[PDB]
Amino acid sequence: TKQVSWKLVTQYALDTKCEDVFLLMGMYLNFQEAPAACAACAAADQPNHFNHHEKHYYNAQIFADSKNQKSICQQAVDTVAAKQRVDSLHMTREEMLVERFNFLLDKMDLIFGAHGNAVLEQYMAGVAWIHCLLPQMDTVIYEFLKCIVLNIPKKRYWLFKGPIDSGKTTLAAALLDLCGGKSLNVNMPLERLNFELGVGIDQFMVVFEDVKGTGAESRDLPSGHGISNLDCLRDYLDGSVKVNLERNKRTQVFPPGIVTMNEYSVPRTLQARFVRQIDFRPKAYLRKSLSCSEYLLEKRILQSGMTLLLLLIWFRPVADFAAAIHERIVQWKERLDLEISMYTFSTMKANVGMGAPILD
Amino acid sequence: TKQVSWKLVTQYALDTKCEDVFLLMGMYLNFQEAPAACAACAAADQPNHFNHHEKHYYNAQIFADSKNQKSICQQAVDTVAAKQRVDSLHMTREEMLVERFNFLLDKMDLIFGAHGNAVLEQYMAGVAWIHCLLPQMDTVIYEFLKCIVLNIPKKRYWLFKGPIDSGKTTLAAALLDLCGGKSLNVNMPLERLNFELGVGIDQFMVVFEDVKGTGAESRDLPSGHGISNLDCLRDYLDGSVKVNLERNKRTQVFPPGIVTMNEYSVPRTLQARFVRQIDFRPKAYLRKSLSCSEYLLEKRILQSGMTLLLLLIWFRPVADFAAAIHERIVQWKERLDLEISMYTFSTMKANVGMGAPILD
Amino acid sequence: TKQVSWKLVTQYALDTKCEDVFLLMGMYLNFQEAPAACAACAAADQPNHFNHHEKHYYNAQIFADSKNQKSICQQAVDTVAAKQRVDSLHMTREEMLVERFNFLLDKMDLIFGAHGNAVLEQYMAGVAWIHCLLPQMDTVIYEFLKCIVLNIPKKRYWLFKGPIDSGKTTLAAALLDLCGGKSLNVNMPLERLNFELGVGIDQFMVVFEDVKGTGAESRDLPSGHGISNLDCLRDYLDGSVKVNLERNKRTQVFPPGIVTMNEYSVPRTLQARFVRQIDFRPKAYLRKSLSCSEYLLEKRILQSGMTLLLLLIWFRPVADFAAAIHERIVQWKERLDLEISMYTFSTMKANVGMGAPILD
Amino acid sequence: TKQVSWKLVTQYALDTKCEDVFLLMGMYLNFQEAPAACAACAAADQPNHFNHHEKHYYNAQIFADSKNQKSICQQAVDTVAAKQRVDSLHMTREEMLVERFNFLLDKMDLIFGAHGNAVLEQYMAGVAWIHCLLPQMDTVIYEFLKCIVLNIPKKRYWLFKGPIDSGKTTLAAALLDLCGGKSLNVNMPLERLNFELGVGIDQFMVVFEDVKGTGAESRDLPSGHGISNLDCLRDYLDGSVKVNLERNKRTQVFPPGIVTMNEYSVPRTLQARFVRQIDFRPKAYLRKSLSCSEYLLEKRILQSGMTLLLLLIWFRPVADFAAAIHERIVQWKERLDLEISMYTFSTMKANVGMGAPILD
Amino acid sequence: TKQVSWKLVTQYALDTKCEDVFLLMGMYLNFQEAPAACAACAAADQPNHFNHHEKHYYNAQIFADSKNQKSICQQAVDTVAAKQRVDSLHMTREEMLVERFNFLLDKMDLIFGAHGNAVLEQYMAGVAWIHCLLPQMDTVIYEFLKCIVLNIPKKRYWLFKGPIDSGKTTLAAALLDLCGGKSLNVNMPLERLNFELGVGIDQFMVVFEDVKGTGAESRDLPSGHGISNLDCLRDYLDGSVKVNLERNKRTQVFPPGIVTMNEYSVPRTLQARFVRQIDFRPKAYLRKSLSCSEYLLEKRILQSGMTLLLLLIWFRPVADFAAAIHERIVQWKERLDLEISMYTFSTMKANVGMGAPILD
Ligand SMILES: c1ccc(Oc2ccccc2-c2nn3cnnc3s2)cc1
Ligand SMILES: c1ccc(Oc2ccccc2-c2nn3cnnc3s2)cc1
Ligand SMILES: c1ccc(Oc2ccccc2-c2nn3cnnc3s2)cc1
Ligand SMILES: c1ccc(Oc2ccccc2-c2nn3cnnc3s2)cc1
Ligand SMILES: c1ccc(Oc2ccccc2-c2nn3cnnc3s2)cc1
Ligand SMILES: [Zn+2]
Ligand SMILES: [Zn+2]
Ligand SMILES: [Zn+2]
Ligand SMILES: [Zn+2]
Ligand SMILES: [Zn+2]
C-alpha cells in the first residue's frame, strides 16, 4: 500500500506557520481533488491553498486514505512549535519583526491585488485619521518598534491612559497587530494569574489590555485586580532577568509591550515601570470624521497592523526598514504613489480636522 | 480479511454534519442489513438513513466486524470539526446563512412531505401570530439577518427586553434556530465565565439568554451576575478585535447575536453596546389567541426557525434571498400559494387581533 | 489461533441492554462452561444467562483465552450507548414506553413464573393499597403516562407535595420505575448543578426528589438550595427549547417528570411550571393497613413499577395499551382473573379502608 | 517463544479474591522458584502461596520473562471485580454470608493449626468478655446477622450509642469484620460526601463510624457534620429504593449496617431511621478484667470477626448455621469441646464479672 | 536484533530497592562501558555501581540501544513496589527491622571503610552526646524499638515535647532514620489531610513532626491545625483496626511512631493516645559541647540512624540483636573496641557534661 509523507505534511504546516491540528487536517484534505479542475485554484483568493495544491496533490490523495490522520497532523504542528522554540532563542529581534512585516505584506499583496476586495484609498484614509491621533505619529510608531526590537531592561513598557473611545484601545490593538503579539487580561485574582501570564511564551510583544484599579467607582470606573496584580510583576515588566512562565513550560525574559487603562490612580512603584506614558484625550473632530467615514469601522481598518505599516511605507524612506524587505517596500511605495500624493494626503488630514468625510 | 473504508465512514459523517461519535457509530451500524428488505428505507422518514443505506451497505457489513469501531468514528467526527475550522475561515457569512437555510429547507421538505406528519397550515398560523408580535415583523427579521451577515463592529448586538411571556424569549429562540447559533448563560461568577464563552467557537451567532441584574428583588426579579459580567465583555460584544476563547482553543472575533433580559437597570457602558433595543410588552389578544390555538405550543412552532423562514418565503420576493437557494424558494412559494392566499393570511392576523382561534 | 467474535459479545450486550463493562465481562465469562452440565441453566432463574448460554458457549471459551477482554467489552458497551443515541432521536415516545413495559413484563414473567419466588396475591394487595391512596388512581397513573408520552411544552411536570410517609415518595418512586427514568438531587449549590442535570441525558423521565426550601426551620423542615435552583431552570422544566446538558455531552429537550417536596413555600414563578399539583395527606387507615401487611414493605412492592403496571392491567381494557403489547396484556389479564375477582379486589380495598390486613 | 497463560494468572486472582494489582504481581513472581526446594512451601504458613505454588510454577517462570506483567495482572484483577459485580446481582444474601464465614473459617483453620501461632483459649477468653458486654449476647449477634441478611426496608440500621471505651467501638468493629463490610466517615462537608458514600459499592454491610453532632462542646464532645449529613441520607438508610453511588459507578440499594456515636442529640427524623438502639455504658469490671488479660488487646482479639464466629459456634447448634457450612461447624464444635466446657466457660464469665484475669 | 533482559533490569532494581524510574534508568545506562577500564569501579565508592557493573554490562549495552527504556524501568520499579506489598503482609516486624539494620550496616561498612571518608571517632562523639541527652539512653532507644516491633494497640505512640533546640527534633529524626520511616505534616486543614496520611502506606513507622496547637501566641508559639487534626485520628494512632489510606490505595493498620511538638496544651482525648511522653529541657552544657564539636552538626551525625545503631552496638551485647545480624554485630564490636574503650567513652561523656569539646 501507498505510504503518506509525514515530512511533506510537516513542510506544508511549516510553510503556512500552522498551529491548529484541525485546521491543518481540513486544509490538507482539500488538496485531494485534481488541481486542473479546482475552483479554489481558479479563484486564487486563498494563498495557503492555491500556492500549495499542486505540490501536495498526490500526498493528499494518500492522506485521504490514512487511518492515522490526526497523528500525522500532530507531528506537523509539533514541528511548527519546535521551529518557534529554535527561533525564539536564535533569531535576532530585528529578524522577528522582518518575519511579521513579511506576513503583513503577503496579506496586503492579496487583499489589494487582482483577487482581493480591499480598497487601498480606504486604508489610506485610516492612515490620515491615525496620523491625526497624536503629533509626529510616524515617529511615535517608529520609536515604539525600536523600543520592542531593542528590548532594553526597564525601558520596554509604554502606558496608554485615557477614557473610552479616545483612540487608546485602537492604537494599542493596531500596534499589537503590527508586531504580532498577544493580549493579556490581569483583572482576575492572583490564583489564576500565572496561567494567563503563560500566554506570553515565545511571544514578540504583549498588551495588558484594559487594566482596572480600585476606589474609582465614584468616577463611574469599574473595580478590578489589574493595577494591584501589575504592581507585583516588576520582574516581568523590567525584563532584567528570566521569569518562570507556565501554561512549568518555559524560562524566558517576559515580552515587552503596552499596558492600557482608564483614568485610575497609578501607584508610584507601578508608574516607575513605564519609560513612556501617552495620555489619550477624546477629540470631537476625530469622532465626527469617523462617523462620516463608516468604512473605517465596518472594515476594521483602524485596528489593523496593515494600516500602521502603510503609514510607515508612506512617511518613511526605504533605509528606515530592514535590508531584507527593501524590494517589497519599494514596490509598495510605487503602488501608493499611483493613488495618493503628499497634496491629496494633506487634504485627507485637513478633512479629519474639520470632522468631515476623509474621502472626497 | 476485508478492510473497512475509513474515508467512506468520514464521507457519511461529512454528508450528515455528524459531530457525535456515538450517534455516528449507531447510525453506521444500522446500514449493515440488506437495503431491499429494510423497513426504515421503505418508511422513508429519516433521510440520514434512507439516502445513505445503499451507498454504505457493504462498508457497514465490514464495519460491523471491526475491532476498532470507536477510532474509525473518532477520525470521521474529527474530519467534520476540521471542515468546520476551514469553513469558519474561508466561507463568506452569506454562504454560512445559505448552508443553514438549506438545512432548514431539507427538514421542511421532509416534515411537510409524503412521509412527514407536520401540518403546513398550523405553521402558517404561527407565521400570523409572529407577524402580530411586532410592527413590520418581516422587516425586523430581515434586518436582523443583515446585522448577523454584515457583522459590523459595534453594530452586531440587539437587546430584547420585557417581562415573562411577552414574546421576547420566543422570538430570540426562533431567530437562534433560523441562524443556527448557540445559547449562553452568563449568570455564573467570572471564574466559570471563560469556559461558557468558549461555547461560541466557530458559531454563526449567539444568544445571551435571560441575563439577570442586581437590586431588582423589590420588583420580584431574581438576582444574578449576568449584567455585571456582560459589562466586562466589551471586546466580545463590539467585535472590533479577535478574542481568545477556550473550552486555549481558538482566537476569533466573538460571534454577533442577541441579549435577552427582564426589566433590570442597564448600565450606560453596557447600553452603548446595543445597536438596537426591542421592548416586549404582553398583549392580552396574543395570549388568548395562543390559548385557542394550542397546536402552536404543543408542536413547538413559535420557537422554530422553519416558522421564521416560512414568514420570509411568504412576505419577501425571490430576489431577497441568495441566488444559490432561488430554485428552492420558488418551489416553496408555489407550495404556500396552494394553501394560503393574501386574503386568508389577513383573516388569520385578524383572528390573532381578536384573541380568537387563528384557524377557522 | 482462534479469534473471538467482538460482534457476538456486542450482540449479547445489545440483547441484555448492558451498560456496565465489568458486569458484561463477568456475565460473558460465565458462558465458558458446558451448557449441558450448567447448574445455572438447569435452575432457569436468570434469563440473561440461560437464554444466551448455548448461543455464546463457543465464543465465551475463546473470550476466556483473550488478552484483550476489557477492550472487547468496552466496544460492546459503547454499541449499547450508540443504539440508545439513535433511539433517543428516532423512536417515538410511545415506542419508548412499550420498550419499558416489555422490560417490566419480562421481569413479571420470571418472578411470578415456575422458577420465580414472588407471590402475585401480595402484589395485588399493593395494587389495592395504591388504589386507596388517591381517588380515580388508575386514571391518575394513565394521565401521568399520557403527560410523559405527549411531552407537551409547559405541561410536562407534576408537583407532589406533602409531609413524610404520606404516599408522596412511594408513588413518585413507583411512577419512576414504571417509566424507567432517573432521580435527581438539586439541594446542592449551583456550582455542582450542571453535572447533576447531565444525569437526564437520553432519559425518558426524571424525578427531582425531596426538593428543599428555606425559612421553614420553625416548622421542623430542613434548609436547602432545591427550590431556589429549580426556579432558575425554567427552560429545563418547560421543554420549549433544547438545553445544553453535560456529564458538553448532548443538546436535547430536558426530560419531563415529577418534583417531590415537603410543605415549603413555592415561588409564583416556580409554581407556574407545574400543570398539576397533587397534595398528599397522611391517612391513619393506610399506615395501619400497611403495618398489618408487612410483606408490602419487606418485598418493596409499593415502590415497584410492576405493581403500577398490574394496577393498569387490572383496571384498564386491552385497547388502552399500545398494539405492540396487546398479546402480553391479554395473557396477564387471564393470569390475574385466575387469582382475583372484582369482588375479592373490592374486599381488599375495604380491608385497606378499615386499617386491617389486606389479605384474609 | 513461550506464551504466558493470562487465564491461569486470573484463576489465581479469582481463587485468592485478589483486588490489588501489585500484590498479585508480587505473589505470582514468588511462584517462579522450584516448589521442591521452596522454604515458603515447607513452612506452610501462607495458604495463598503453598496451595498454589505447584499449580502456577511453570506459568510463573514464563510470567517472570514477560514484558507485559502489569497488564496481565490488571486483566486478572478486573475479572475479580467482574465476578464481584455478577455476585452482587445473582447471589442471595445468605450465600454472601456463607462466603464470608468460609473466609473466616479458612483463617481460623490456619492460625489455630499446626503452622499457626494463635492460642484458642485466648480467643475463648474474648468470647467470655464479649458475652459479658450485653445480656443475651449470642442472640444480639444472631439477630444482627438476620437484620443484615434479610435487608428489610426501614429495618436495616442499628444505632450504637455511648461514651469512649464502652464496648461500642469494639462490638461494631467485630460485627463489621464478621460480615465483611466497610467503615465510612461522614464528618466531612456535603461536597466530599458522595465520594465517601461510593465506598459502599458491592459491599455486604457498612459502619458509619464515630458520627459527630453539634453544640455538645459544653460536654467535651467534638463538633462535626456527621449527624447533619446522615439526616439528609434517608434513602440510603431506608433501602426502599436504589441510590446512585459514585467513586457515576453503580445504581444499587445502599448496604445495611450500623451507625456508632457518642452521647449527641439525635434529631427525630434521624432517630426514626433505626430499628434498634443499643446504649453502651462503661462497666468497671469489664475494664479491670481486660487490664488483667492484656493478650486480648495486644492480639486484637476483641475486634475480630473470628471471635464473634467462635461465640456463635460455642453457643448455637449446627442447624442455626447455613447447610453449606454444617461440616465445618461440626469440626469446630469438636475442637472447642476438647479445650473448654460449659463449666470452664462459666468460670471465665465469673472471672470477667469479678474484674480478675479471665484465664486461671 | 539483540533483546534486552527486562528480568535482569528488574533484578538490579530489586537488589538496590530502587523506587525511582529515572534513577534506575541513569544507573543502568552507566553500566554500558567496559568494566575493566571503568573509573567508578576502580574508585569503589558506590556499591550500587561497582557490585553490579560486571553482572549487568552486556545487558546495559543492549539497554543503551533500546527504544523502550522508560517502560523497561517502569516494570522494574513496579516489581520493587510489588515485593514491598508482599513483605508488608508476610514479613514479621522483627524481619522488617533486620532489613533496615542491614541497610544501615551496608552504609557503615562503606563510609568507615577503605573507600569511605567518615571518621568513626566523630560518630562515637555523637554517641556520647546522645547518651547525655536522657538518662538510661540505650534503654530508651531499645524500648522504642520494642514498641515499634511489638506494635501493640494503644501502646504504639510516644510524645516528644519541648521548646526549640532541646534535642527533641534531633532524637525523633535519628529514631526515624534508625527504623526507616516517613515524616508527616498535619498542620494543614482536614481537606488535604487524607493525602498526607496516605504517605504512611507500607511504612514501618512515622513521625508527626512539629505538631502545632492554638491560643499559644501569647507564649510566642505559632498557630496550626496539627493538635486538632491528631485528636480526630484515634483509629490511626491506636492501631486496633485497619484504616483506609489513599494517595483508595491500601487498607492497613496505620504505622506506629512519634508525635513531636512544642509546649502546647494537649487535649485529654489526645493525651490518652500516648503510652509515653518524654519532656525535652534545653541544657546549657549540651549546646556548649556541640559548639565546641562542630563536626557533629556539619556532618549530620546527631540526626543519623547510624549513630543510634553505633550506640546500640557499643552498649548492648550480641544477644540483644536478632540472630540474623549476629555476625555483623560481632565484627562491628571488634571495630569499635580498636578505637574506643569504656574509659575513653566515659571521658567523652565527662567532656559533654563540662560543655567542652567531646574529642581531646
Ligand atoms: C461611534 C462610537 C464610538 C466611536 O469612537 C471610536 C470608535 C473606534 C475607534 C476610535 C473611536 C474614537 N477615537 N477618538 C478619538 N477622539 N474621539 C474619538 S472616537 C465612533 C463612532
Ligand atoms: C399559557 C402560558 C403562557 C403563554 O404565553 C406564551 C407562551 C409561549 C410563547 C409566547 C407566549 C406569549 N406571548 N405573548 C405576547 N403577549 N402575550 C403573550 S403570552 C400562553 C399560554
Ligand atoms: C412504618 C413507618 C412508616 C410507614 O409509612 C409508609 C411507609 C412506606 C410507604 C408509605 C407509607 C405510608 N403511606 N401513607 C399514607 N398515609 N399514611 C401513610 S404511611 C409504615 C410503617
Ligand atoms: C486501657 C484503656 C482502655 C480500655 O478499654 C477498652 C479498650 C478496648 C476495648 C474495650 C475497652 C472497654 N470496654 N469496656 C466496657 N466497659 N468498660 C470498658 S473498657 C482498656 C485498657
Ligand atoms: C547552634 C544552634 C543551635 C544548637 O542546638 C542544637 C542543634 C542541633 C541539635 C541539637 C541542638 C541542641 N540540643 N540541645 C539540648 N540542650 N541544649 C541543646 S542545643 C547548637 C548550635
Ligand atoms: Zn486548488
Ligand atoms: Zn435502510
Ligand atoms: Zn448456563
Ligand atoms: Zn512455595
Ligand atoms: Zn564500573
Side-chain angles (χ1 to χ4, degrees), chain E residues 110-168:
Chain E
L110 177 77
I111 67 163
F112 302 115
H115 305 279
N117 296 109
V119 184
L120 189 60
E121 205 185 27
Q122 292 179 2
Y123 278 75
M124 290 318 292
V127 169
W129 191 99
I130 296 294
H131 209 257
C132 288
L133 188 67
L134 297 172
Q136 311 180 267
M137 184 54 108
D138 57 291
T139 294
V140 172
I141 303 167
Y142 201 76
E143 295 195 328
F144 180 72
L145 295 186
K146 284 220 265 80
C147 169
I148 301 308
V149 168
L150 292 176
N151 200 21
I152 296 152
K154 299 150 107 71
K155 299 173 186 285
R156 332 159 75 225
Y157 271 88
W158 283 24
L159 178 56
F160 282 18
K161 203 171 169 175
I164 59 160
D165 307 311
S166 59
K168 168 201 81 204

Side-chain angles (χ1 to χ4, degrees), chain D residues 71 85 109 167 173 205 233 286 307 318 348:
Chain D
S71 296
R85 287 236 147 276
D109 287 346
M205 80 145 282
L233 300 167
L286 294 181
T307 308
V318 169
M348 289 194 265

Side-chain angles (χ1 to χ4, degrees), chain C residues 166-187:
Chain C
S166 59
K168 168 201 81 204
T169 305
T170 302
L171 188 63
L175 289 163
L176 184 71
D177 195 50
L178 182 65
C179 303
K182 291 250 188 290
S183 54
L184 308 169
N185 192 312
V186 289
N187 295 124

Side-chain angles (χ1 to χ4, degrees), chain B residues 129 133 165-167 170 282-283 286-287 290-291 297, chain C residues 154:
Chain B
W129 191 99
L133 188 67
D165 307 311
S166 59
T170 302
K283 284 116 179 278
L286 294 181
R287 187 178 184 105
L290 242 179
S291 303
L297 281 158
Chain C
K154 299 150 107 71

Side-chain angles (χ1 to χ4, degrees), chain B residues 57-89 91-248 250-267 269-337:
Chain B
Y57 170 58
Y58 305 111
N59 203 43
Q61 283 183 298
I62 309 161
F63 182 80
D65 293 320
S66 183
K67 298 171 178 72
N68 208 205
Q69 287 175 356
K70 201 187 185 192
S71 296
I72 297 159
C73 294
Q74 191 59 67
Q75 179 168 289
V77 160
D78 286 348
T79 308
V80 174
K83 221 276 259 182
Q84 214 74 240
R85 287 236 147 276
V86 167
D87 296 342
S88 76
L89 281 158
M91 231 173 237
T92 67
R93 295 182 61 77
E94 185 196 27
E95 282 170 344
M96 294 177 182
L97 192 63
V98 162
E99 205 176 64
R100 180 59 180 184
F101 276 18
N102 274 313
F103 170 92
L104 294 171
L105 292 154
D106 283 351
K107 199 168 156 190
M108 280 157 73
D109 287 346
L110 177 77
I111 67 163
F112 302 115
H115 305 279
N117 296 109
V119 184
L120 189 60
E121 205 185 27
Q122 292 179 2
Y123 278 75
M124 290 318 292
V127 169
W129 191 99
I130 296 294
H131 209 257
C132 288
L133 188 67
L134 297 172
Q136 311 180 267
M137 184 54 108
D138 57 291
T139 294
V140 172
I141 303 167
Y142 201 76
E143 295 195 328
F144 180 72
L145 295 186
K146 284 220 265 80
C147 169
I148 301 308
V149 168
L150 292 176
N151 200 21
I152 296 152
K154 299 150 107 71
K155 299 173 186 285
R156 332 159 75 225
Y157 271 88
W158 283 24
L159 178 56
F160 282 18
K161 203 171 169 175
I164 59 160
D165 307 311
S166 59
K168 168 201 81 204
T169 305
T170 302
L171 188 63
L175 289 163
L176 184 71
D177 195 50
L178 182 65
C179 303
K182 291 250 188 290
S183 54
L184 308 169
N185 192 312
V186 289
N187 295 124
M188 46 183 66
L190 283 128
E191 192 199 58
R192 300 172 69 88
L193 236 192
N194 288 286
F195 211 84
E196 186 68 33
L197 295 168
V199 169
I201 296 164
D202 303 320
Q203 297 311 297
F204 194 54
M205 80 145 282
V206 296
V207 176
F208 287 89
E209 308 202 320
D210 197 41
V211 171
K212 299 173 182 188
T214 48
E217 288 157 291
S218 58
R219 287 157 72 220
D220 208 44
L221 296 179
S223 267
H225 296 267
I227 272 132
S228 297
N229 283 335
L230 274 179
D231 201 21
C232 295
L233 300 167
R234 184 172 183 187
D235 288 279
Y236 291 74
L237 300 177
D238 282 357
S240 285
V241 295
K242 288 173 184 174
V243 290
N244 311 119
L245 304 166
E246 54 219 282
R247 215 212 286 105
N248 205 270
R250 208 212 172 181
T251 295
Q252 59 162 98
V253 171
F254 190 79
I258 308 168
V259 166
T260 72
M261 59 176 275
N262 212 306
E263 294 175 288
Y264 296 97
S265 184
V266 181
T269 52
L270 177 59
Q271 188 67 62
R273 313 283 119 255
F274 305 99
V275 60
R276 202 212 264 240
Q277 179 182 308
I278 304 173
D279 301 288
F280 293 85
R281 234 122 265 178
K283 284 116 179 278
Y285 60 91
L286 294 181
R287 187 178 184 105
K288 254 213 92 187
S289 189
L290 242 179
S291 303
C292 295
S293 308
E294 288 172 287
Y295 49 87
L296 294 179
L297 281 158
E298 297 169 322
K299 303 185 180 186
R300 299 172 174 84
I301 289 158
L302 300 177
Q303 294 87 13
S304 186
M306 293 180 286
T307 308
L308 297 197
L309 181 53
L310 282 163
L311 188 153
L312 255 27
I313 296 160
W314 183 257
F315 282 90
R316 301 306 197 89
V318 169
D320 279 5
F321 295 89
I325 60 168
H326 279 185
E327 215 180 312
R328 305 190 76 175
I329 302 303
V330 169
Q331 71 201 49
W332 269 96
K333 285 184 170 287
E334 289 178 282
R335 180 71 189 271
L336 294 182
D337 281 350

